[PDB]
Amino acid sequence: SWDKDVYPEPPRRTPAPSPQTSLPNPITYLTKAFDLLVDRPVTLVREFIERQHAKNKYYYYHREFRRVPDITECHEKDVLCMFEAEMQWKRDYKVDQEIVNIIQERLKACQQREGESHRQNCAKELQQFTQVVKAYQDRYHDLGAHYSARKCLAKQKQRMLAERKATKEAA
Amino acid sequence: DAPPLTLEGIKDRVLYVLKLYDKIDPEKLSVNSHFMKDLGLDSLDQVEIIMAMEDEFGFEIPDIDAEKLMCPQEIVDYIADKKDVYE
């Protein structure tokens, strides 16, 4: 399985055929042939593997963390503080990359399930895609290659200062 | 892609397609017979001979060997050189 919380799926809508023919039905003959040929021993191999690993078990977990406080709660030098701040920041950056990955995967799914109803029931998912990617363009984009953490925060002050003065004069 | 070829067969074929030509007699046609010396047929029509036998066997003999054969036996020699027919 997986988490349908994070990976939503639409309700299944399967139509039913209706012959109205006397061929009679070659493709049903062949799909029953495929199931009764391939599907039995592969399921039995699955059963064998399940039991033989169901003798004894292992366990893997998810690595969870604490929270080191801030970068603006570190001073001008503070190597034993800035290090914690940057590593926490860079791990946030990596998991945000995978956030954008998952949203793009949802967009691919929306293109594929709709077929040629492109402009219906993909406004929601493409719209939230544009929202998160507007956020990502604003926040993590125009910083270049050698990001440390401080270039991000200088960008942060630059952006909010410029938009503050622009909405100040245009208020 | 490899037909059977003999010296006798190719010699008789060259002598055949010589003997079909008009202004030489079928009478005095010899395997040893100089086209220049003792038959008296012209060198120009000897190059017509060269042209037609080239066209039959399907490869150009060069201009530099369009000079110095003058007899059917050396013609069989040069065609056996191009075709590599010995056993």
């Binding site: - | 060198s43 120009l44 080239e54 490869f59």
Partner: protein, 176 residues
């Protein structure tokens, strides 16, 4: 530019123009019957002044005939599928392996082909045994200080093989 002499001749140049014009006419003039007609026409046009004893008249009309030949040549003539430029032109160069090789085979493979390799051994001894005396003697004596030709005489002196036979005779079969 020929292995016998330097000058070609008047007659050789006339004759090569004849072969080229007739071959071009083959390419231009399909169905072969109107070709045969025009071949007699070309042979007659050479026979219009075959009677010329002159030399400057012959080469002047030959030059005008070269103008006339290049005037009506053909783009892709019927060149043979063995002639250079043609369709094959070492088509079957896929297995023209040179004959100096086969010395470097593993002795299992030379155990596979016994009698042929014994025959190549006695050929190679026939080469080496008959290289010193007759060939080196005829390459001392018969070359003049200027050789001045691209063709050697055979060993008509007394006995065995003419010189330089090896990489002339022992050429591949042109046939895989």
């Amino acid at each position: 530019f020929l292995p016998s002499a330097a000058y070609l001749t008047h007659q050789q140049k006339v004759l090569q123009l004849y072969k080229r014009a007739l071959r071009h006419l083959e390419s231009r003039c399909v169905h072969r019957d109107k070709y045969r007609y025009f071949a007699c026409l070309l042979r007659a046009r050479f026979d219009e002044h075959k009677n010329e004893k002159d030399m400057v008249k012959a080469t002047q009309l030959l030059r005008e005939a070269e103008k006339e030949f290049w005037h009506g040549q053909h783009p892709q003539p019927y060149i043979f599928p063995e002639s250079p430029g043609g369709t094959s032109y070492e088509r079957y160069e896929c297995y023209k392996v040179p004959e100096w090789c086969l010395d470097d085979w593993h002795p299992s493979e030379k155990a596979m082909y016994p009698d042929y390799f014994a025959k190549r051994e006695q050929w190679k001894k026939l080469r080496r045994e008959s290289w010193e005396r007759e060939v080196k003697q005829l390459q001392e004596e018969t070359p003049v200080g200027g050789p001045r030709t691209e063709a050697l005489p055979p060993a008509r002196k007394q006995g065995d093989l003419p010189p330089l036979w090896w990489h002339i005779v022992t050429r591949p079969r042109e046939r895989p």
